[PDB]
Nucleic acid binder design. Structure first.
Lengths: 37, 174, 214, 58, 143
RNA sequence: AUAUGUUAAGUGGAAAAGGAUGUGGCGUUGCCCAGACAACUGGAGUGCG
RNA sequence: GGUUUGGCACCUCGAUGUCGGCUCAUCGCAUCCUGGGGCUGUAGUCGGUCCCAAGGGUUGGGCUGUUCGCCCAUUAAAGCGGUACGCGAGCUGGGUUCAGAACGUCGUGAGACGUUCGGUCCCUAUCCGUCGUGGGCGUAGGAAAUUUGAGAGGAGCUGUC
RNA sequence: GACGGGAUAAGUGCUGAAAGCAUCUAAGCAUGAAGCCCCCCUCAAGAUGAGAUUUCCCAACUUCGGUUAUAAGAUCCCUCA
């Protein structure tokens, strides 16, 4: 996945949720996984 | 908290006892499911249970959705059935049953053998469909993933254990 | 599971039945007696206690450590043995041994091929930074650093020598064990084990031949 | 040191030190003295009536 | 002039046993490090050993608030190079609960010629029993 | 000690552009009883292979 | 971030005396190898990126005083940095920077700044530190043996068939 | 330098609300590395918190309230590894 310090929704299928105090982006695609928000 | 509103709707064939701060459930399929309710009030008048919710500070609101979706899945758990079917894909794969321990010829140099639990049921269809009947919702949930994690499904030829009702991904290997 | 005590004799070689050639160690094992049995009923652990190569009894003008004194004779009276010279102690055994003194048989290692031999060492005493630790030495033609250690530390940002450098001192004498040796041939009427390969000690030493853990 | 002994005298009568050298400036005009924590060591019956007079007008 | 100095045969030091269950770690160790120094009594002087012997039972039920059970660590060193060793306060409750309280108290004791003798009036036990019944303690309701 | 509210990271007890359904206060709007938003059953129109 | 080239002139001119390689280390993670994963424009073998990870390992030579460097044969890999650009009361003195001499060049002149051949490297360890090994007294009587292990050290790699 | 065992990191999870759905989490649960704590080898009770188990020696005095000696045990001395 993409470990970058700016998470941002790219398309409409991608949602934002915080797990263990980290803003993550989980999505149906495998290329749109993002953390470290 | 609209999940914190619906009733349990005990169908008048179900045993529910508030053993202090526990719940002991006996039913016509599986009995003696024990659990915990931390501080929510349960008024259990005549075959229905309404949960009284305290005030603000979401600690008193997050646990109000949980502690009445934990018992709603036991009253409708000791009677009803479960989504539990598991399907294999590929050539030369077979799900062979040996007693109550499943052995999966899955494409290795060693066959993988799984062990069972208490109040749960393994059953195998024709060659390659593996059911897991149970009464604990975590036990049927875990052992549908302890089986699946032997070989997760591929994005190329589909081979490996999957569920029934979910689409795996496809590509072109060129 | 248990072991015996042994006095090293020497090294020669036997031949295998297939055509091989085994270098072997002659370890004799004379009179061995279980002197007590430390249990968890009384204070402590679970163990037994063997002796080896008994001494003489007692004398009024007892001059040296040939004769047994009064404290180390009543200890070898309850277990009704002669006073033994080298007393050691073995854990991780059964309770097949009696607390009263029965003799430990050399006929219990007839094919047990997992053997730890726990000797002392030969005790060289020849000190030195090269021969103790296997360090290198400088050029004996161009420069000067013929046999010596070098920097004992880094420099003035430390300004100390770290505990555990490598300096001269008395080499040899530390107890070592060797693991997973095998047994070739046991004997009666000589009470000799033939344990394969070298053992850690001088001649007329003392070894402790116990069954391996790995 | 004198303040340490007085503080370890009023806490057994369930009062602070800072509640004790408050009342004895305000209830009475008991003159400010801390070397005369010798009363608390010597005569506990003498030290008790001061604690009565401090609570009385505070 | 008129001051008092309590000395080696002018005082007694009686025993206290304190149930250390159901209360936190550093809120307990202040009503122990002041009993060992003797600030519950008048005729407190410096430079002598006043105070009371303190016994602690139920070391297994002390508390922590927040993630101190996983993010409080106890670094120690060993004077060889590269020797720092780490141990957390969640595995120290279960393994050796006799040491955990005994260093929560001895960090609060003075300069260490007499503060070594004050600290050794403290007996820390893990269970609910103690072999000091021959010394006649009593329960101390600490605030 | 006291009367009141805030913080859940050991922040307090090292520093930025940017990101963020963390949470508390003060205002403003548009839909909502024809019951509304969400799920839930059968017009060249929003991504797709 | 504080390793490069620098800026300031605060510490040492009654001494802080300067480069690389031998001998022996030791630490950091911004990881070269090995261990576990996530995407992949990943069919399979090979790869590419990014995140957790310091436990061990990290070759032998030719040319240069060499720092960099370039090449040759391998190997699982031939990591980048700090410790007075680690270490000269441990070694080297080839180098840089002494007196002799020569060229090129500049100077009317004594002489001078790029190369060249030669050119003394001192010390018996008082205290802290480290590696070994013995006396004294203490553990409430005085002695002979055998041991629990609080803690602290050691080891940790991997090829090919 | 073996093979294990217990707790974890990145990650993969199951049930589940805040937020009728969705959701690896906030309450509860599984799994997971040559790394961490043990396992294996060595030193270690001066660990002044100075531990433990077996065994040996135990009287004649004096008012000196405590001694002088012997016991069990080691040692100087000589023949040596």
């Amino acid at each position: 996945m993409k470990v970058r310090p700016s998470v941002k929704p790219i398309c409409e299928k991608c949602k934002v949720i915080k797990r263990k105090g980290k803003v993550m982006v989980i999505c149906e695609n495998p290329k749109h996984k993002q953390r470290q928000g | 908290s609209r999940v914190g509103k619906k009733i349990i709707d005990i169908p008048s064939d179900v045993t529910v006892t508030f053993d202090g701060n526990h719940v002991t459930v006996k039913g016509p399929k599986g009995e003696l499911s024990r659990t915990l309710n931390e501080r929510m009030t349960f008024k259990q008048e005549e075959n229905t249970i309404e949960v009284v919710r305290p005030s603000e500070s979401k600690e008193d609101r997050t646990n109000h959705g949980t502690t009445r979706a934990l018992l709603n899945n036991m009253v409708q758990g000791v009677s009803q059935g479960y989504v539990k079917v598991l399907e294999l894909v590929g050539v030369g794969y077979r799900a062979q049953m040996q007693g109550k321990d499943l052995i999966l010829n899955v494409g290795y140099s060693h066959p993988v053998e799984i062990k069972a639990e208490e109040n749960i049921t393994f059953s195998v269809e024709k060659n390659t469909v593996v059911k897991v009947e149970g009464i604990s919702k975590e036990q049927v949930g875990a052992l549908a993933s302890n089986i699946r994690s032997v070989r997760p499904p591929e994005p190329y030829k589909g081979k490996g254990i999957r569920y029934q009702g979910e689409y795996v991904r496809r590509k072109e290997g060129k | 599971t248990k072991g015996i005590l042994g006095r090293k004799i020497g090294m020669t070689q036997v031949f295998g039945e297939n055509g091989e050639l085994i270098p072997v160690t002659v370890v004799e094992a004379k009179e061995n007696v279980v002197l007590q049995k430390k249990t968890v009923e009384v204070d402590g652990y679970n163990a037994i206690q063997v002796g080896f190569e008994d001494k003489k009894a007692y004398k009024k003008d007892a001059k040296s450590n040939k004769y047994a004194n009064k404290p180390a004779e009543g200890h070898a009276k309850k277990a009704d043995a002669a006073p033994k010279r080298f007393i050691r102690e073995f854990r991780n055994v059964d309770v097949d041994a009696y607390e009263v003194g029965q003799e430990v048989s050399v006929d219990t290692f007839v094919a047990g091929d997992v053997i730890d031999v726990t000797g002392v060492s030969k005790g060289k005493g020849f000190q030195g930074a090269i021969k103790r630790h296997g360090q290198s030495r400088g050029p004996m033609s161009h420069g000067h650093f013929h046999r010596a250690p070098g920097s004992v530390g880094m420099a003035s940002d430390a300004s100390r020598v770290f505990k555990g450098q490598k300096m001269p001192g008395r080499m040899g004498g530390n107890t070592v064990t060797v693991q997973n040796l095998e047994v070739v041939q046991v004997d009666t009427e000589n009470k000799v084990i033939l344990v394969k390969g070298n053992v850690p000690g001088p001649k007329k030493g003392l070894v402790e031949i116990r069954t391996s853990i790995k | 040191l004198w303040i340490t002994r007085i503080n370890a005298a009023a806490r057994q009568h369930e009062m602070s030190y800072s509640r004790l050298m408050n009342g004895l400036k305000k209830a009475g005009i008991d003159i400010n003295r801390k070397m005369l924590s010798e009363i608390a060591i010597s005569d506990e019956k003498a030290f008790a009536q001061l604690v009565t007079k401090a609570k009385d007008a505070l | 002039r008129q001051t008092f100095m309590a000395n080696e045969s002018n005082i007694e030091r009686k025993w206290y046993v304190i149930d250390a269950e159901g209360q936190t770690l550093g809120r307990l160790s202040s009503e122990v490090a002041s009993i060992l120094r003797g600030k519950n009594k008048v005729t407190y002087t410096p430079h002598v050993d006043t105070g009371d012997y303190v016994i602690v039972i139920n070391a297994s039920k002390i508390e922590f608030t927040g993630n101190k059970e996983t993010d409080k660590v106890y670094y120690r060193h060993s004077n060889h190079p590269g020797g720092i060793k780490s141990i957390t306060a969640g595995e120290l409750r279960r393994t050796n609960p006799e040491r955990l309280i005994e260093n929560s108290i001895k960090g609060m004791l003075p300069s260490t010629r007499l503060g070594e003798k004050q600290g050794k009036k403290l007996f820390v036990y893990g269970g609910a029993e103690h072999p000091h019944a021959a010394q006649q303690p009593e329960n101390y309701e600490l605030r």
